[PDB]
Design a protein around this ligand. Structure first.
Ligand SMILES: Cc1cc2nc3c(=O)[nH]c(=O)nc-3n(C[C@H](O)[C@H](O)[C@H](O)COP(=O)(O)OP(=O)(O)OC[C@H]3O[C@@H](n4cnc5c(N)ncnc54)[C@H](O)[C@@H]3O)c2cc1C
Ligand SMILES: Cc1cc2nc3c(=O)[nH]c(=O)nc-3n(C[C@H](O)[C@H](O)[C@H](O)COP(=O)(O)OP(=O)(O)OC[C@H]3O[C@@H](n4cnc5c(N)ncnc54)[C@H](O)[C@@H]3O)c2cc1C
Ligand SMILES: CN1C[C@@H](O)C2=CC(=O)C(=O)C=C21
Ligand SMILES: CN1C[C@@H](O)C2=CC(=O)C(=O)C=C21
Ligand SMILES: [Zn+2]
Ligand SMILES: [Zn+2]
Lengths: 230, 230
């Protein structure tokens, strides 16, 4: 019954364009009766570093630290840091995970990258036995809501930065799809700083308009063809 | 003449394959008479998060905080956090910058992504205009030395992960080249964890061997065709 939604927000300013898109997602999804949880990473001062402090108690090898094996063991032994576990709890219960963030070097901001590095550990998000279409998070929907600095023009197959689908690869396919996520079509708000009040008001409008039928949307075919192909 | 190289290291275990590759570069370049410097991010507990704490002076817009704008203005006014300016000092005098890290979700670890987000600020690494071939860091060489869990086979066009050059796009083009860096062919040491004891020694030997003639190398054609083809 009903749907649960987690929004991983990554911006320092509540009055930013990102903040508005995030508030619009909450308003709409909340008006729809959906269950909404938000992770304000900056506000939570979320630990981005993948260290040995992510494992509580004794390590399975205090001689040579291997973050990948340690977390897998910590997860299976329920001994991960509480901040990491608190997040996995939200992801486990979610039906739709929305990532709201400004583009930082063709990728997500470091605080957001830390999230994925620490929260999506082996055993919870994936495992040798099953990744991609066999990820441990299959059945869940993922969506990237990103804002850029460069104009949509610059993000064309013949533009300077190249086609936006290029930088989406490491995120949609390499991460989301890898964990079994049904990646939805990204929502990109091109150069909101450059745009005007009219244009900006219009961007946030399309965001909310789309949020009315996201449960109706079809998962994007996360393939090498979709991103780079033609 | 002499040369200065900066290795931005990002691994927690000094005994890891990455740590070995890092000590190797340090030994080889150093043997050649080169000026080397290592930025062991984890050992420095490097701040990955981009926040208002990176600016010391008065904020241009104390009402709405904008990291990009604030760090640009702070850089010109010399009001950036010392940990940030200390890194820019290293990059500035560097002829070659090598990034030593294990692949994390088709990208760099959060701690290393934070370095790119905070260190390569507007005014220092690039300007608008003044990016890509016009980058402020033009005349410098940059190299990505990545180690992964996946195998070379998995990282092929028809592989489960796609060609390894795909995930190198945001980093080589979107980041380094954007900053004016001449990108040298990446050094990828595939699945050293699965490789045999001899194959591991083989991957290390190939590293130090390539470094012996690194200065005679030429940058790759950092273009969409080089990465994807088409
Ligand atoms: C370290 C770093 C790396 C970066 N890397 C890249 C990169 O690789 N590629 C790239 O393209 N860009 C990059 N950028 C730029 C970045 O993507 C943009 O600055 C950012 O996405 C702008 O979004 P914002 O939310 O910060 O904008 P804002 O600063 O919020 O500006 C947008 C405008 O929206 C207005 N606004 C707020 N709420 C509303 C509302 N409800 N209705 C109408 N208007 C509203 C604001 O007041 C403001 O004037 C980078 C920036 C930094 C700091
Ligand atoms: C959060 C997270 C996300 C990840 N995402 C991805 C991803 O998207 N794609 C992907 O492919 N992988 C991914 N990985 C896996 C990661 O890239 C590999 O685990 C890592 O690159 C292995 O390098 P290492 O230095 O950590 O190995 P090590 O743990 O050091 O193991 C390699 C072996 O090398 C041996 N060794 C070290 N030095 C020497 C030497 N001098 N001579 C001989 N043998 C030596 C070691 O003792 C060890 O047995 C991820 C891992 C984590 C933790
Ligand atoms: C801060 N800012 C404004 C925006 O124009 C922009 C584009 C980039 O590619 C980048 O690295 C930084 C940017
Ligand atoms: C630790 N490990 C094993 C290696 O096979 C691997 C590939 C990934 O894509 C990933 O996220 C984690 C991995
Ligand atoms: Zn995919
Ligand atoms: Zn390029």
């Amino acid at each position: 019954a009903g749907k649960k939604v987690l929004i991983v927000y990554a911006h320092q300013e509540p009055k930013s364009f990102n903040g508005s898109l995030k508030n619009v997602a909450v308003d709409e999804l909340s008006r729809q009766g959906c269950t909404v949880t938000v992770s304000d990473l900056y506000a939570m001062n979320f630990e981005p570093r993948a260290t040995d402090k992510d494992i509580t108690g004794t390590l399975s090898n205090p001689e040579v630290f291997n973050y990948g094996v340690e977390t897998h063991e910590a997860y299976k032994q329920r001994s991960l840091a509480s901040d990491i576990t608190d997040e996995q709890k939200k992801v486990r219960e979610a039906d739709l995970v929305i990532f709201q963030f400004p583009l930082y070097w063709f990728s997500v901001p470091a605080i957001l990258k830390g999230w994925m590095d620490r929260v999506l550990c082996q055993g919870f998000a994936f495992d040798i036995p099953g990744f991609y279409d066999s990820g441990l998070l299959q059945g869940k929907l993922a969506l990237l809501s990103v804002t850029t600095g460069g104009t949509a023009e610059m993000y064309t197959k013949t533009g300077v930065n190249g086609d936006s689908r290029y930088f989406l690869w490491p995120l949609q396919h390499g991460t989301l799809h890898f964990c079994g996520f049904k990646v939805l079509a990204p929502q990109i708000s091109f150069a909101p700083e450059i745009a005007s009040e009219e244009e900006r008001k219009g961007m946030v409008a399309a965001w909310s308009q789309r949020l009315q039928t996201i449960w109706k949307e079809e998962p994007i075919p996360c393939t090498a063809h979709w991103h780079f192909g033609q």
